[PDB]
């Protein structure tokens, strides 16, 4: 017992937090690992995503070397106050914190060879832009960029420990609207005139799931558009019936539009769903305008020619519009 | 007329039983079960599947639903379940069309369910064909053995739902032909 | 003094375990008017350490069967840094202490049962012992019965009302069908506001979609009836085709489409409801 | 049970065979003139 | 210096409003004897315009002056 105590006591003294390991020597190589516990929420409105993870660094320090103690030492987390750590930080962060209950969720581990493993439980609201031009038929390219604030590559280097096995726990994630397709690791150096700074990047590709929209946005619009075409088979003298059907279909599309935007993200950005709804709106508008023409020409001024041609053109043109839309956006 | 009435009623009973069987096999996940050579315990159906957690009891953790295509771990399963659901819709359409016996002549309604039962059998047959093709998925490969693949049973067993699907196919074909002959009589 | 109760300040001097709750996105302890932490020592060599916590623990809710969904929400904890060889946890045994359920803040859910479990995880930095408590919760359907199911069913019935209206009342039946469609859309808009923005549809979404298809089918049925009534005008037995497609002549018997609809639509809806409720309540 | 799926498979085959026997019995009864 | 993008608001308000107004005009060509048709068209057009008017001030503060 006492031998361990005096070992750690001599380890702590003579150690300067203000100086990095091998200050006059080569840069210290820091391996980095991540274990994602839960991506809590991904926001299109704010263009960000909250991510809870076990971040781990790993670096060799000669000053913290001890011998005669084959057992690994998991010191108290408060000991991390007295030990030097990298200046790692996330560039695309908007807000982040470390969980404090019951004790500060942090860990420092020493090894007999003098290596340090420094782990933290970080909940960070990272930022990623989202090309919503094809929403909801869109795939996002969200990233976590990890870099050193002050040191250049000459003073500190970052690499992924374990290679492609650096990041785990992605399979444990089940987002409520997105489906993770792939994750990629990139280790590089950003070069400026003064010097090159190390950087790591953890990039997830997220595919959006559309079955919600397919069943409550697209299918209602298609069926209201077809119910609008039902007008062309109603007898031309039935002005009340045909006008009521057309105007109520227009009102129903307006209702779908107005109440949809209440639920989708609050962004004045033009999206694919907006084009689809606008096209269906134009189609129902033209369906009512068709009866305007019909009532003026024949009643106002052996099915008539306008209904005869409408019955084929409107379904055919709507099918062509659907084909172009789905081919362009998919 | 007595004999025709009796056989018609019995045919209705059998069609209802076939519809119940179709619902049971569609919802239930016991199409493929684990085996002695299987690496882990579990069982997968058309869309739903239970996987061994990785401990003594395994908790029978399950995930997968036809309501969520994103959770079905293959494109062959999404087609097989779709065909089985189409069969469900057709047989239920016939069960509704029993109501048309009130007004329409008997022969026409009998023939209409004859074609609906034939189409239900065809869709169920197609679902049974494409269902094995999805056994090559990563989840199924991890479950029913590495050797398991497209139509390759491998280190894994087969459970009652898969054979009951073929039983329902046979029942559907028999009922379709029975209704066809009833219509002309 | 056999029991030395301790102040809440110097507890930091005494080593305490690194117990942290794994499935917690945010937790805290209230600090006023004093810290809400206590410690006690017993000269036999025992330490007791009690806190006050309000954990917003996560719970992955599988809302596929919403509002018929039952959940088993977990609450897990383990040492943050010490593997199994360094710390091992355990229960007091003899169940877990819970107060009266009637005073709990469970409105949308009803408490059912409590369970405890322990296991060892295989994380990269050693193998930690994790202990979990599962709370079983069952949702109450009463709000969704009056908000969604009964209004949707009654709107479908009002769509069926069109079959008993005279066929020549074109504006009446057209307005009835299209306004039923509009009302169903209005209900469908609010059906999802309680739920999160989940991308797969639920049981209630499927119910609403089927009701929308039923009212759409009723309006299409009237349109079909209106167009045709006014605007238009070998081996066994015999042939193999005779055994199959009657297709005789072909419709002559289409003016009586309303009589067919009057039975078909209620019967189809009843069958859909039977299968849906049996599947989601008992057989699922 | 572990991997024991003999009884369930056997009883499923038995009830399916019984149902098919009833179906083909009715069909054969109708086929005869 | 920031310049607003107007295409979103274009498709949201300017085109639907213009088309509801063109549909109102559609009444002028319907036969005058069709009292229920023209009355329903006019009043439901007013209702649709009322429904559209509410979504105007959905991404804006409650400035007393009008935009
Ligand atoms: C597993 C247990 C299941 C128990 C269910 C038992 C139900 C069994 C019913 C079989 C019906 C088919 C039998 C064959 C019918 C043969 C025909 C028959 O019997 O006579 C006709 C119908 O009679 C009739 O009332 C029969 C009318 C059809 C009754 C069936 C309606 C569908 C009800 C929804 C089904 C739900 C099932 C699932 C529930 C769990 C009436 O002659 P009618 O000259 O006037 O016609 C006009 C025409 O002559 C030309 O104008
Ligand atoms: C077919 C041909 C159609 C052509 C179409 C022609 C259309 C003609 C355009 C008009 C634009 C109207 C713009 C002005 C409307 C807004 C009126 C307004 O500004 O509010 C108060 C008006 O005065 C007042 O208090 C009290 C006086 C109230 C006068 C409000 C006028 C309302 C608009 C009347 C339109 C009716 C049209 C009828 C057609 C049937 C002033 O705020 P107050 O100082 O209190 O506090 C400060 C607060 O205003 C800070 O914002
Ligand atoms: C009497 C008349 C009655 C009406 C007729 C019956 C109407 C029936 C209703 C609904 C079913 C319609 C079929 C829908 C087929 C679409 C099935 C599908 O899932 O396709 C996805 C997109 O495809 C892709 O990747 C790329 C292809 C995209 C093309 C999507 C097609 C949508 C068409 C819009 C539907 C209009 C239907 C209206 C018919 C009248 C792929 O899945 P994914 O892995 O992303 O998992 C996400 C998911 O699981 C989250 O819930
Ligand atoms: C339009 C008239 C015919 C169709 C009516 C269908 C039932 C009414 C709509 C369904 C929803 C409703 O009103 O009640 C739902 C509740 C569910 O609550 P709980 O009992 O599960 O707690 O109650 C239920 O459990 C619903 C039971 C419904 C059974 C299915 C209908 C059976 C009809 C005969 C079939 C042969
Ligand atoms: C103390 O920790 C070190 C490094 O974390 C362990 O060293 C590894 O131990 C495992 C299993 O014991 C071996 O498979 C590896 O080859 C060892 N080296 C490395 C670099 O991983 C060491 O075993 C731990 N001490 C124990 C378990 O008593
Ligand atoms: C009335 C006739 C014509 C058609 C009726 C078809 C009904 C019974 C069908 C249509 C859609 C079906 C549902 C589609 C998806 C699922 C999810 C699955 O995990 C359980 C079964 C369940 C919940 C199905 C139950 C049966 C269902 C409701
Ligand atoms: C942008 C669209 C404007 C629509 C304006 C409403 C016109 C609908 C009624 C047109 C009636 C037909 C008039 C022309 C008849 C003819 O050419 O002989
Ligand atoms: C929306 C595009 C589809 C509608 C196409 C309309 C084609 C109309 C062709 C007939 C034009 C002549 C109508 C007047 C006939 C008359 O002299 O009475
Ligand atoms: C894209 C996710 C899958 C959603 C599956 C929806 C199935 C809807 C079934 C509709 C059945 C309509 C029957 C209408 C006639 C009664
Ligand atoms: C409080 C428990 C949940 C709600 C129970 C049912 C509420 C009342 C239902 C009334 C249904 C009226 C149907 C009328 C049909 C003509
Ligand atoms: C429930 C009203 C019965 C009215 C009977 C009058 C003759 C019409 C026969 C068809 C009745 C079918 C009712 C189907 C269940 C609502
Ligand atoms: C960044 C693009 C903004 C959208 C620009 C307008 C797109 C085209 C609008 C067409 C609206 C339909 C007019 C139909 C008139 C009959
Ligand atoms: C610089 C971009 C300008 C975009 C123009 C938006 C036009 C919105 C539609 C208004 C069209 C009114 C025409 C009325 C003709 C009767
Ligand atoms: C919970 O854990 C205790 C102690 O391990 C055990 O006695 C008990 O059976 C477990 N289950 C329940 C329901 O309390
Ligand atoms: C702004 C989206 C316009 C989509 C096309 C409108 C329908 C044209 C049908 C000929
Ligand atoms: C979103 C792009 C839609 C293009 C519409 C082109 C008109 C097709 C119908 C004539
Ligand atoms: C959805 C279009 C409504 C069609 C009415 C019936 C058309 C009959 C054409 C033979
Ligand atoms: C949109 C209807 C146009 C008809 C031209 C005669
Ligand atoms: C005259 C009937 C045309 C139908 C086009 C779908
Ligand atoms: C998927 C779009 C279908 C449109 C049919 C007119
Ligand atoms: C009816 C044609 C639909 C095309 C969808 C890509
Ligand atoms: C709620 C259904 C009422 C039916 C009356 C015949």
UniProtKB/Swiss-Prot annotation, chain A:
It holds the Pfam family Neur_chan_memb. 4-aminobutanoate binds at residues 89, 147, 149, 194. Benzamidine binds at residues 87-89, 147-149, 192. InterPro entries: GABAA/Glycine_rcpt, GABAAb_rcpt, Neur_chan_lig-bd, Neur_chan_lig-bd_sf, Neur_channel, Neuro-gated_channel_TM_sf, Neuro_actylchol_rec, Neurotrans-gated_channel_TM. The keyword Coiled coil does not apply. Histamine binds at residues 89, 148-149, 194. Potentiated by histamine. GO terms for molecular function: GABA-A receptor activity; GABA-gated chloride ion channel activity; identical protein binding; transmitter-gated monoatomic ion channel activity involved in regulation of postsynaptic membrane potential. GO terms for cellular component: cell surface; chloride channel complex; cytoplasmic vesicle membrane; dendritic spine; GABA-A receptor complex; GABA-ergic synapse; plasma membrane; postsynaptic membrane. Belongs to the ligand-gated ion channel (TC 1.A.9) family. Gamma-aminobutyric acid receptor (TC 1.A.9.5) subfamily. GABRB3 sub-subfamily. This is Gamma-aminobutyric acid receptor subunit beta-3. The lineage of its organism: Eukaryota, Metazoa, Chordata, Craniata, Vertebrata. The gene is GABRB3.
Curated annotation (Swiss-Prot), chain B:
GO terms for biological process: gamma-aminobutyric acid receptor clustering; neurotransmitter receptor localization to postsynaptic specialization membrane; regulation of inhibitory synapse assembly; sensory perception of sound. Belongs to the LHFP family. One of its GO terms (cellular component) is postsynaptic membrane. This is LHFPL tetraspan subfamily member 4 protein. The chain holds residues 16 to 200 of 247 of the full protein. Interacts with GABA(A) receptor subunits. Identified in a complex of 720 kDa composed of LHFPL4, NLGN2, GABRA1, GABRB2, GABRG2 and GABRB3. Interacts with GABRB3. Interacts with GABRA2. Interacts with GABRG2. Interacts with GABRA1. Interacts with NLGN2; leading to mutual regulation of protein level and synaptic clustering. The gene is LHFPL4. Its main location: other. Keywords: Cell membrane, Cell projection, Membrane, Postsynaptic cell membrane, Synapse, Transmembrane, Transmembrane helix. Plays a role in the regulation of inhibitory synapse formation and function by being involved in maintening gamma-aminobutyric acid receptors (GABAARs) clustering and their associated scaffold proteins at inhibitory synaptic sites. Acts in concert with NLGN2 to recruit or stabilize GABAARs. The keyword Aminoacyl-tRNA synthetase does not apply. It comes from the Eukaryota. The chain crosses the membrane at residues 7-27, 82-102, 112-132, 163-183. It is a multi-pass membrane protein. GO terms for molecular function: GABA receptor binding. It is found in: Cell projection, Dendrite; Postsynaptic cell membrane.
Swiss-Prot record, chain C:
GO terms for molecular function: benzodiazepine receptor activity; chloride channel activity; GABA-A receptor activity; GABA-gated chloride ion channel activity; transmitter-gated monoatomic ion channel activity involved in regulation of postsynaptic membrane potential. Residues 166-171 are cytoplasmic. Allosterically activated by benzodiazepines. Activated by pentobarbital. Potentiated by etomidate, propofol, pregnanolone. Inhibited by the antagonist bicuculline. Inhibited by zinc ions. Potentiated by histamine. It is a multi-pass membrane protein. Heteropentamer, formed by a combination of alpha (GABRA1-6), beta (GABRB1-3), gamma (GABRG1-3), delta (GABRD), epsilon (GABRE), rho (GABRR1-3), pi (GABRP) and theta (GABRQ) chains, each subunit exhibiting distinct physiological and pharmacological properties. Interacts with GABARAP. Interacts with KIF21B. Identified in a complex of 720 kDa composed of LHFPL4, NLGN2, GABRA1, GABRB2, GABRG2 and GABRB3. Interacts with LHFPL4. Interacts with SHISA7; interaction leads to the regulation of GABA(A) receptor trafficking, channel deactivation kinetics and pharmacology. GO terms for cellular component: axon; chloride channel complex; cytoplasmic vesicle membrane; dendrite membrane; dendritic spine; GABA-A receptor complex; GABA-ergic synapse; plasma membrane. The gene is GABRG2. It catalyses: chloride(in) = chloride(out). Glycans are attached at residue 116. The keyword Disulfide bond applies.
Swiss-Prot record, chain D:
Expressed in the blood vessel walls. Detected in colon, brain and pancreas islets of Langerhans (at protein level). Detected in brain, and at lower levels in pancreas islet beta cells. Residues 11-31 are annotated as: Required for interaction with LHFPL4. It is found in: Cell membrane; Postsynaptic cell membrane; Presynaptic cell membrane. It comes from the Eukaryota. The chain crosses the membrane at residues 11-31. Transmembrane scaffolding protein involved in cell-cell interactions via its interactions with neurexin family members. Mediates cell-cell interactions both in neurons and in other types of cells, such as Langerhans beta cells. Plays a role in synapse function and synaptic signal transmission, especially via gamma-aminobutyric acid receptors (GABA(A) receptors). Functions by recruiting and clustering synaptic proteins. Promotes clustering of postsynaptic GABRG2 and GPHN. Promotes clustering of postsynaptic LHFPL4. Belongs to the type-B carboxylesterase/lipase family. This is Neuroligin-2. The lineage of its organism: Eukaryota, Metazoa, Chordata, Craniata, Vertebrata. The chain holds residues 668 to 700 of 835 of the full protein.
């Amino acid at each position: 017992m006492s031998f361990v105590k005096e070992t750690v006591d001599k380890l702590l003294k003579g150690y300067d937090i203000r100086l990095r390991p091998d200050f006059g020597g080569p840069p210290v190589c820091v391996g980095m690992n991540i274990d994602i516990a839960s991506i809590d929420m991904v926001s299109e409105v704010n263009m960000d995503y909250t991510l809870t993870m076990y971040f781990q660094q790993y670096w060799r320090d000669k000053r913290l070397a001890y011998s005669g103690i084959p057992l690994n030492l998991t010191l108290d987390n408060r000991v991390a106050d007295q030990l030097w750590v990298p200046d790692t930080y996330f560039l695309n962060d908007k807000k982040s914190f470390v969980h404090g209950v019951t004790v500060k969720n942090r860990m420092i581990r020493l090894h007999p060879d003098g290596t340090v493993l420094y782990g933290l439980r970080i909940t960070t609201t990272a930022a990623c832009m989202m090309d919503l031009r094809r929403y909801p038929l869109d795939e996002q390219n969200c990233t976590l960029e990890i870099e050193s604030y002050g040191y250049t590559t000459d003073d500190i280097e970052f690499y992924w420990r374990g290679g492609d096995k650096a990041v785990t726990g992605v399979e444990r994630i089940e987002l409520p609207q997105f489906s993770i397709v792939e994750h990629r690791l990139v280790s590089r150096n950003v070069v400026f005139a003064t010097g090159a700074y190390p950087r790591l990047s953890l990039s997830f590709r997220l595919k959006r799931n559309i079955g919600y929209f397919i069943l409550q946005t697209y299918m209602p619009s298609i069926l209201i558009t077809i119910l609008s075409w039902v007008s062309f088979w109603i007898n031309y003298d039935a002005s009340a019936a045909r006008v009521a059907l057309g105007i109520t279909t227009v009102l129903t599309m307006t209702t779908i539009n107005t109440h949809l935007r209440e639920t989708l993200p609050k962004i004045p950005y033009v999206k694919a769903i907006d084009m689809y709804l606008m096209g269906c709106f134009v189609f129902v508008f033209l369906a009512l305008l068709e009866y305007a023409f019909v009532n003026y020409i024949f009643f106002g001024r052996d099915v008539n020619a306008i209904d005869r041609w409408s019955r084929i053109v409107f379904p055919f043109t709507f099918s062509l519009f659907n084909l172009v839309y789905w081919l362009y956006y998919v | 007329m007595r004999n025709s009435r009796a056989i018609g009623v019995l045919w209705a009973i059998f069609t209802i039983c076939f519809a119940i069987i179709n619902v049971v096999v569609f919802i239930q996940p016991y199409w493929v079960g684990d085996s002695v050579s299987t690496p882990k315990p579990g069982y997968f159906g058309l869309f739903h599947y239970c996987v061994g957690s990785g401990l003594a009891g395994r908790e029978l953790t399950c995930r997968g639903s036809f309501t969520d295509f994103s959770t079905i771990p293959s494109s062959a399963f999404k087609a097989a379940a779709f065909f089985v659901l189409l069969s469900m819709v057709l047989i239920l359409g016939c069960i509704t069309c029993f109501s048309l016996f009130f007004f329409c002549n008997t022969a026409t309604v009998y023939k209409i369910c004859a074609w609906m039962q034939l189409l239900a059998a065809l869709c169920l047959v197609l679902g049974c064909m494409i269902f094995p093709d999805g056994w090559d998925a990563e989840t199924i490969r991890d479950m029913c053995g590495a050797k398991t693949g497209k139509y390759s049973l491998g280190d894994c067993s087969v459970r009652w739902a898969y054979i009951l699907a073929i039983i329902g196919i046979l029942n559907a074909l028999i009922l379709s032909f029975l209704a066809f002959v009833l219509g002309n009589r | 003094i056999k029991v030395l109760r301790l102040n809440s300040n110097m507890v930091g001097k005494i080593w305490i375990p690194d117990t942290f709750f794994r499935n917690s996105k945010k937790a805290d302890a209230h600090w006023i008017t004093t810290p809400n932490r206590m410690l006690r020592i017993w000269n036999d060599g025992r330490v007791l350490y009690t806190l006050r916590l309000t954990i917003d623990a996560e719970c992955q809710l599988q809302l596929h069967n919403f509002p018929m969904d039952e959940h088993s929400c977990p609450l897990e904890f383990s040492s943050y840094g010490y593997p199994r060889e360094e710390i091992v946890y355990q229960w007091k045994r003899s169940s877990v202490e819970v107060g009266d359920t009637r005073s709990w803040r469970l409105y949308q859910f009803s408490f059912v049962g409590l369970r405890n479990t322990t296991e060892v995880v295989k994380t990269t930095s050693g193998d930690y012992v994790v202990m979990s408590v599962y709370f079983d919760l069952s949702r109450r359907m009463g709000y969704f019965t009056i908000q969604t199911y009964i209004p949707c069913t009654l709107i479908v019935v009002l769509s069926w009302v069109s079959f008993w209206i005279n066929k020549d009342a074109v504006p009446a039946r057209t307005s009835l069908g299209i306004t039923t469609v509009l009302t169903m859309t209005t209900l469908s808009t609010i059906a999802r506001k309680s739920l999160p923005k989940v991308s797969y549809v639920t049981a209630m979404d499927l119910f609403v979609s089927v009701c929308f298809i039923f009212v759409f089918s009723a309006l299409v049925e009237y349109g079909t009836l209106h167009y045709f009534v006014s605007n238009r005008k070998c081996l066994d037995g015999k042939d193999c085709a005779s055994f199959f497609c009657c297709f005789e002549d072909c419709h002559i018997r289409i003016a009586k489409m309303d009589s067919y609809a009057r039975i078909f639509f209620p019967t189809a809806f009843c069958l859909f409801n039977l299968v849906y409720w049996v599947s989601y309540l008992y057989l699922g | 049970d572990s991997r024991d799926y003999s009884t369930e498979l056997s009883v499923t085959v038995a009830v399916g065979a019984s149902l098919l026997f009833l179906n083909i019995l009715a069909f054969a009864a109708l086929y005869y003139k």
